[PDB]
C-alpha cells in the first residue's frame, strides 16, 4: 500500500537488482530501454537527443553487456548504433527487468564482461475463465504523451495476451532556452498466446511488430525508421523427473530495419561534407535458441544447457545525381549482405546451500564464435578480406561465494570471474583502419578477455536497508576506437586496468518519512599507453526523501554529479570520443502519487525544477549543423513537468 514514484532501485540479492518496470520514474524515461536503467546505480546514458540513448554500465560500452528479451536477443543494423538494442525496448509493456552486475552468470549468453539485463514477461496464471487489463496514459512539456495497453483472457488450459503502446515527444528545451533536436515517436504491438495442458507444462508461441522514428542532435543525420519485428517459441516443463526440475527450450527471431535519411527530419546541412540529400537503409536479423535443463537434489542446483545464435546484417544507400539533382531513394538499389555472425555454447551453473547460512556458485562455459566478412567493395574500393571468415573458441566462468552473518540480517559475497567475448559487428565492420600493420579492423582486431573480482554485502535490517558492492578487474585486449581527422576511426587492442563500486541505503525514519541515497563509482585506465580510458562516467549521487501518510506520498530528490577530469582526448568507441573535462552539476526534483481507487493511481512530477542548463560527460557531440560549435555536447533538458495514470483490473 502507499504509492510512491521511483528514484533509484536497490541491489536486493547479491549482484543483483530486480525491479517492476511498470512503476512510475521519477526523472520520465523517454519509452526506451536505456532510460529504464538511469535508475539503477552503476547506469549512465550516452543521449544522441530525446531519446534512443547508449547505456553504459560501470564505465563498460556497447556488446559488453548483454541485454535480453525474453530469453532472447536483438540487434540493431545502424553501423554507428544509432537504433541501439534498448532503442527496440518498451519496458512499460514488460513485466519484470532484472540486472546481474559483473561476469557472474553463464546461462545468458557469451561475452558478458560488464553485465546482463533481463527483461521479462511473465505467463498469465489464469484459473477459472477470466481477464486482466492495465493500462497507462502520460502527459508531459514538449507535446510528450504515452499511451500503454496490457491485457490478456484465458483459462487453466491457456491464454491469450496483447501489449502494446505509443509515445511521443516533441523537441525538448535546455536549462538555456535552447530547442534541442530531439522528436521522437514510438509504438510497438505484440501478441503472446500460452497452451498449458497441465501445470507441469507450458508452451507459448510470441509475434510483435514496432515502429519509431528520432531526431538525433548529435549524428548528422536522423532516423526515420525503427522497423523491428520479433517472433517466438518457448517450451517449459516442471517436475520431470525427482532430481530433474525442470526444461526450458527456447527460439526467437528479431528482425530491425532502419532507415537514416537527412532531409526526412532536418535540412542537409550546405555546408557540411552531405549538402545533398542521403539515406541509407540497413537490417538486421537474428536467429536463435537456448536449451537449459534445471538438477535439483541433495544441497545442489545444477542447471546445465546449450544455446545458439546467428545473425545478418545489410545495407543499401540512395543516389543523388547533382546535375539532374535527381534522387533515387535506397530501396530502388538491391540490399547488400555485409556480416554474418554465428555462436554455439554449452554451459552448466552450480550451486551448493552449505549449511543454511553459505552459498558456494560456481559456473562455465564454453562458446565457439565465428563471423564471415561478406562485404564485395568497400567505401568505391576493393575489400581485401571479401568472403573471408575468422572463428575462435572462448572459456568463460566465474565462482561466487556468500556468506551469511550470525546475528545482523547481512549477507557477504566475494566473487571470481572471467569472460572472453569475441567483437561484436561495430567493432569488426564500422572502423575505417584497423590497427597498425593490419588491412583492416575485421581481419586482426583480437577476442576482449576479462578478469574481475566483485565483493559487496547486503544489509537487510527493519528500519535501514543497505547494499554495496565494487569490483577490481584487468581487461587483456580491450577494444578502443581512437579518432583522427573528415574524421576517421581506428580500432586498437590495448590492456587496461578498471576499479569502481556502488552502494546505497534507504532508512525508515518515522512511519511516514522514509530517506534514501546511492554512490556510483567507475574508474578506468588504459595499461598500454598509461593514461585514462575514455567515455568513463565521473562519480554520482543521489538523495530521496519521501512523505508517505495512507493513500499519497511527496518526493523530493537530488542528484549531483562530480566532474570527469579523466579523460582520453579523441578516443572513445563507435559511437562517440572523449574530448574535453565535463563540468559538475546538480539537479533537483519533486513527485507525488495518490491512489484514487483500487484500479487507478494518479502521479505527477517536476523534473529538473531549478531549469539547470546541462550536459552529461558521455553526451554526444552535437551537430554544427544545427547550432552547435566544434565538440559542444548535447544539453539534458531543462524543467520538465509530467503527469500519469495507471489502470489495471
Ligand atoms: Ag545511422
Ligand atoms: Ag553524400
Ligand atoms: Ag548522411
Not at 552448466?348 to 553459505?358: H, K, M, S, V
Request: aromatic share 10%; hydrophobic share 35%; net charge negative.
Amino acid at each position: 500500500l502507499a504509492p510512491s514514484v521511483v528514484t533509484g532501485v536497490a541491489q536486493s540479492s547479491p549482484l543483483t537488482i530486480v525491479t517492476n518496470p511498470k512503476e512510475p520514474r521519477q526523472p520520465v524515461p523517454a519509452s526506451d530501454g536505456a532510460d529504464y536503467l538511469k535508475t539503477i546505480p552503476g547506469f549512465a546514458v550516452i543521449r544522441n537527443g530525446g531519446s534512443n540513448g547508449d547505456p553504459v554500465l560501470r564505465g563498460m560500452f556497447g556488446s559488453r553487456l548483454n541485454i535480453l528479451t525474453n530469453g532472447g536477443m536483438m540487434l540493431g543494423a545502424c553501423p554507428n548504433r544509432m537504433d541501439a538494442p534498448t532503442s527496440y525496448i518498451s519496458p512499460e509493456t514488460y513485466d519484470k527487468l532484472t540486472v546481474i552486475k559483473g561476469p557472474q552468470t553463464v546461462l545468458w549468453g557469451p561475452g558478458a564482461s560488464a553485465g546482463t539485463i533481463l527483461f521479462e514477461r511473465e505467463p498469465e496464471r489464469f484459473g477459472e475463465l477470466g481477464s486482466r487489463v492495465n493500462a497507462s496514459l502520460l502527459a508531459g512539456s514538449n507535446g510528450r504523451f504515452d499511451k500503454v495497453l496490457d491485457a490478456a483472457a484465458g483459462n487453466r488450459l491457456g491464454y491469450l495476451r496483447f501489449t502494446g503502446n505509443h509515445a511521443q515527444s516533441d523537441d525538448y528545451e535546455d536549462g538555456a532556452g535552447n530547442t534541442v533536436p530531439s522528436r521522437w515517436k514510438k509504438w510497438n504491438g505484440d501478441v503472446a498466446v500460452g497452451w498449458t495442458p497441465d501445470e507441469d507444462t507450458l508452451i507459448e508461441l510470441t509475434a510483435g511488430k514496432g515502429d519509431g522514428e528520432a531526431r538525433y542532435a548529435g549524428r548528422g543525420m536522423d532516423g526515420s525508421q525503427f522497423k523491428r519485428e520479433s517472433l517466438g517459441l518457448r517450451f517449459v516443463k516442471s517436475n520431470v523427473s525427482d532430481v530433474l526440475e525442470k526444461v526450458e527450450a527456447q527460439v526467437y527471431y528479431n528482425y530491425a530495419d532502419a532507415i537514416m535519411d537527412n532531409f526526412r527530419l532536418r535540412t542537409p546541412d550546405p555546408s557540411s561534407m552531405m549538402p545533398m540529400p542521403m539515406a541509407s537503409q540497413v537490417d538486421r536479423r537474428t536467429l536463435g535458441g537456448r536449451l537449459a535443463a534445471t538438477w535439483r537434489w541433495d544441497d545442489f542446483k545444477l542447471v546445465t544447457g546449450v544455446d545458439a545464435m546467428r545473425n545478418e546484417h545489410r545495407a543499401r544507400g540512395s543516389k543523388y545525381d547533382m546535375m539532374t539533382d535527381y534522387y533515387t531513394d535506397a530501396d530502388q538499389f538491391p540490399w547488400s549482405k555485409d556480416a554474418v555472425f554465428h555462436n554455439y555454447g554449452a554451459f552448466g551453473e552450480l550451486t551448493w546451500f552449505a549449511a543454511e547460512r553459505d552459498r558456494l556458485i560456481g559456473g562455465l562455459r564454453l562458446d565457439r564464435a565465428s563471423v564471415k566478412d561478406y562485404r564485395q567493395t568497400l567505401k568505391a574500393m576493393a575489400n581485401p578480406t571479401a568472403n573471408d571468415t575468422r572463428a575462435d573458441t572462448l572459456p568463460s566462468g566465474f565462482v561466487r561465494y556468500e556468506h551469511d552473518l550470525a546475528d545482523s540480517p547481512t549477507t557477504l559475497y566475494a566473487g571470481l570471474g572471467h569472460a572472453e567475448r569475441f567483437p561484436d559487428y561495430w567493432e569488426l565492420f564500422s572502423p575505417k583502419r584497423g590497427p597498425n600493420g593490419s588491412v583492416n579492423a575485421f581481419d586482426k582486431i583480437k577476442p576482449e578477455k576479462t578478469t574481475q573480482l566483485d565483493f559487496g554485502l547486503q544489509y537487510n535490517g527493519d528500519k535501514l536497508q543497505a547494499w554495496a558492492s565494487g569490483y577490481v578487474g584487468v581487461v587483456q585486449d580491450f577494444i578502443l576506437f581512437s579518432y583522427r581527422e573528415g574524421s576517421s576511426t581506428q580500432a586498437t587492442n590495448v590492456d587496461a586496468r578498471i576499479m569502481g563500486g556502488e552502494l546505497g541505503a534507504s532508512y525508515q525514519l518515522t512511519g511516514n518519512w522514509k530517506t534514501d541515497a546511492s554512490l556510483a563509482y567507475a574508474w578506468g585506465k588504459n595499461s598500454s599507453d598509461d593514461r585514462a580510458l575514455p567515455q568513463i562516467p565521473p562519480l554520482e549521487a543521489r538523495f530521496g526523501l519521501t512523505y508517505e501518510e495512507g493513500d499519497w506520498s511527496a518526493g523530493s530528490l537530488w542528484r549531483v554529479v562530480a566532474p570527469q577530469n579523466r579523460i582520453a582526448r579523441d578516443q572513445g568507441n563507435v559511437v562517440g570520443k572523449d574530448f574535453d573535462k565535463s563540468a559538475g552539476f546538480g539537479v533537483f526534483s519533486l513527485n507525488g502519487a495518490y491512489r484514487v481507487t483500487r484500479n487507478v493511481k494518479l502521479s505527477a512530477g517536476v523534473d529538473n525544477l531549478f531549469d539547470k542548463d546541462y550536459t552529461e560527460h558521455l553526451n554526444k557531440a552535437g551537430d554544427a549543423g544545427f547550432g552547435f560549435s566544434a565538440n559542444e555536447t548535447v544539453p539534458e533538458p531543462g524543467r520538465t513537468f509530467w503527469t500519469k495514470v495507471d489502470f489495471s483490473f
